[PDB]
Amino acid sequence: PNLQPYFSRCFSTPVWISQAQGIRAG
Amino acid sequence: MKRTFQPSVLKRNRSHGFRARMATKNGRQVLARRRAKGRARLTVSK
Amino acid sequence: AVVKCKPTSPGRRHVVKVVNPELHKGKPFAPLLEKNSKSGGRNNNGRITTRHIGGGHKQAYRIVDFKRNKDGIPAVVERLEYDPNRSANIALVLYKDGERRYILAPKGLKAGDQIQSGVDAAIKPGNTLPMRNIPVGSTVHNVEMKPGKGGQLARSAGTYVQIVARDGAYVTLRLRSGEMRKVEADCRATLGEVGNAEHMLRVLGKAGAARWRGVRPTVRGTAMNPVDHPHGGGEGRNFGKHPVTPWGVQTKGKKTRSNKRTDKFIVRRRS
Amino acid sequence: MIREERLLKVLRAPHVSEKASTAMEKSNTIVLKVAKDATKAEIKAAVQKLFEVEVEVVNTLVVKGKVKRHGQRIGRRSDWKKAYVTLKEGQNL
RNA sequence: CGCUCGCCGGAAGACCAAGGGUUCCUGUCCAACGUUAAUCGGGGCAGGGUGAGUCGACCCCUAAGGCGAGGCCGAAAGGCGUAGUCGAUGGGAAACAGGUUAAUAUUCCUGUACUUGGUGUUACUGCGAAGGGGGGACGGAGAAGGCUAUGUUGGCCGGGCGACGGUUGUCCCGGUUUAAGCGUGUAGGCUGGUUUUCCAGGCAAAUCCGGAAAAUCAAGGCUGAGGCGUGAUGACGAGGCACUACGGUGCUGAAGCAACAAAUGCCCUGCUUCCAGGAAAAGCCUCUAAGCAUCAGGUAACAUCAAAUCGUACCCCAAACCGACACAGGUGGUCAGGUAGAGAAUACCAAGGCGCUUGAGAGAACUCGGGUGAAGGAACUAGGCAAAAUGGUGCCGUAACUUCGGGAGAAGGCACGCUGAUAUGUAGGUGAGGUCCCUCGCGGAUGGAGCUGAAAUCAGUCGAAGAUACCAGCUGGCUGCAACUGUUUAUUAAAAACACAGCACUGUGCAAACACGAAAGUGGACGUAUACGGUGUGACGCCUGCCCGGUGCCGGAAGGUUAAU
RNA sequence: GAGGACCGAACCGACUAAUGUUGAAAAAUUAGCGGAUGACUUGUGGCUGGGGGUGAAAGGCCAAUCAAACCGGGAGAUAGC
């Protein structure tokens, strides 16, 4: 079948909520 | 591990089913808003 | 009697049991039982309206006759029985016409004793009479406050009231807290005092012994956050506040009786 | 006792399978596609009246419709009911 | 496909529920999908496949809880709740074994059953409920005994006679299966039995239940595994044999016993014991009332018919479910063989299932994961972190302190293999035929073959080492804190924090205080001051000093001030 | 033959270390670790709803979201930045 019926966008963002170590003061 | 969605049709149809939506005023407004949108499936039912 | 347990464990060391060999070793009388399901402290709205309730052992409600309306019919106490729904023990009596009832157990009451309700009975523990016929100073229990309603006063395990005076259509009773309270003399009362008077001597010993009575743990308001209890937070152990309920109403002394309908029947509040 | 025009509407089609033909040769069982609301009594009444034979026991099942993808969409075939009519000893059709 | 090899085997196997929804099977294709190739696939495509009186749902019955006629409340929406009606995760009804398909089977087929309901005769006939009473019907733990599943060995039966020494023996391999149902009714367990009279009980009224005496017998009834008969000269059956593509299908088919050890399964919803005192309703049995007349029903046997309708394929510790994935995770119940072992641990295996969907080389550093080390032994480091070590059973032995229980496996020793005898296998366990008596049959007493079998001591022996693997405690001393078990920041904090039993103070007289709620109402509680709520403290031991000015609370109300009016 | 007794699997947890950190995994693996007849654990239903619940109390949890969930609306809030 050389028809090309492709797919689409099929879920959103899990997490950009990511690592956070690194400071200069507290 | 244990994820948030553990399916059960009985707990589904008693929460979001058609008769659960048609029991209250605010669920018949849900079904009114889903006919007014044009939704294919109205509830979770079939 | 009371008996201290041998400390073979922590949680067994401080236990004091209150054993009664006079109690029935068997299943209770089945017609006088009833399903008693727990609440959790939850009302019909489903919200907790009384904290620290929940869990515990399954209990079946025993229908106890507090009214004692079988007047003039002699009964005989078949056996004393444990009741998980109250502090006293209960007495399966059997009237002469073949009806079994549950009454509260008086102090001097054993199996094989006679009891008799009615105004023409004798003055002995287990007999129920209206207080026009009971002599003054008699220790009585299971006292009705309204004539024909059922006993409400003096019903816990080793409790009693004294008919300390009587004139007119009103006796006046010294209740177990020290309150002198007037009650109309047509109310019934059982003679003697309630029987399980060794109940205040038992020690639970361990935390789960309270847990299998249905008493969930009490979180101390000072150990909470300011959002939860008016006893706030604080960096460390701080108090600095007058002690209050979780809803900001002052404990440690503030009187909360406001009932102007029944204070005409109280002649002296408790000391 | 079933009305006659009801019996003329339950037997849809004789079903050919090579399991159905094994049942016809070895257990005297014709396998019919029937109507969806067919009861085992209505099939028994219709095989006897319309095929002019005798029937011992009708066994039925409901075949689920396969989901197929014709072109680019997702269709679903119809559920259909399938009887297993066991004739007693004399076989006509 | 084959032959090896490795791996799992309390699972990585078999099977249900959930959830999914055709992934099942077959023939086809190999674009994409599949972390590579693919002829293969849970991919594409087209067929095929799910068979029920008995299994499940439906159904009858209710629990929590929902909804709730009237009802009570509430600006409205609506909240609550009575009758009632729903709601399983519980209670009610009945099938097993072989055979079968490429794929379905307690469903199909053979065999043998069984359940409920509608319908046709007998004698003696009182049958009859939105009612009464039974019953259903219920906890934790513990202890056996009786078994059985199952296993193990012997016997029997079929076959073998050894690719390298030996192997016609006390050899080797394999099999030695069979159910519901029906019959009998015993190991057990429960319980006095029966008539007769009377009555303020069970709203009635009851010949039932409960009560009360009274005669007569405790010798009566329920209950209950498992056996043993039947089912069954049947089925199944190791293996040969035409069959024949030797796959496979097809016809045959011998033995089919016994002893011992056995559950966590059954007897048992029992028994004993504890306190924390352990659903409900129907089906069921039974009593009658209104009713009802050789009507209507009931009862028995016999005969007929009826048992609908849905689900039924497949996955289920998973590539089909939940995790975006063919995802090292999560996921209820059931079954659970051998050899060691206390064991569902562990090691190795069976039945069974797989080798985890990129390989081939090479044998640098470095990094993971391990192994081993001279001499030293904590010198490392924030810190014995990590690793090493300890580890079993029996016996001897064991301190301060102690709330007298503990500490305690304190510490610390020693004995362990194999062979032989004691004893051709003991102590025990089991138990045959035989003997003997009866209430003579699933007996009882004795009997003691057969079978099974520790443990111990002497002696001998082997090795560097005998709990040889896996498995499996490091120990002690002095202190802080918290009595303790427990709980806690899902996802950087498990603690000294929280809880706690106890303690005290305080409120609270029941239409309780409190709480939820504009309310009704409901929790508290079907409880009632030996009870409940709130607060603080936190076992236990010894204890709890002084201050009432401030701030609260409590009590007083003469005065001063003071609202609406 | 008791026990919030002891040892120890299932089970429930989560103390330590290493790995992992564009992971096999949006919290896991591996080796040890604590509880394991109970204040246990688990299934299936139910019930409590957002200034609200529930909390052996951490501001914990309430659908990978929590010192006030999510969705839609006011709404193109306002924003001397």
Residue numbers in the entry:
A (entry chain z): 3 to 28
B (entry chain 6): 1 to 46
C (entry chain c): 2 to 272
D (entry chain t): 1 to 93
Provide the publication's sentences verbatim.
Cellular protein synthesis takes place at the peptidyl transferase center inside the large ribosomal subunit. The newly synthesized polypeptide chain passes through the ribosomal exit tunnel. In this contribution, we integrate liquid- and dynamic nuclear polarization (DNP)-enhanced solid-state NMR spectroscopy, mass spectrometry, theoretical modeling, and cryo-EM to show that oxidation of cysteine residues in the NC can occur within the ribosome exit tunnel in ribosome nascent chain complexes (RNCs).
To determine an atomic structure of the NC containing an intramolecular disulfide bond, we prepared a sample with a higher oxidation ratio of 63%. Thus, the shortest construct U32SecM with four cysteine residues was used to determine its cryo-EM structure. All these interactions potentially stabilize the α-helical conformation of amino acids Phe150 to Tyr28 and the loop formed between Cys32 and Cys22, and bring these residues in close proximity to form a possible disulfide bridge. In close proximity to Cys22 and Cys32 are Phe150 from SecM and Arg95 of L22. The formation of the observed disulfide bond between Cys32 and Cys22 might be enhanced by the tight space inside the ribosome and the surrounding amino acids.
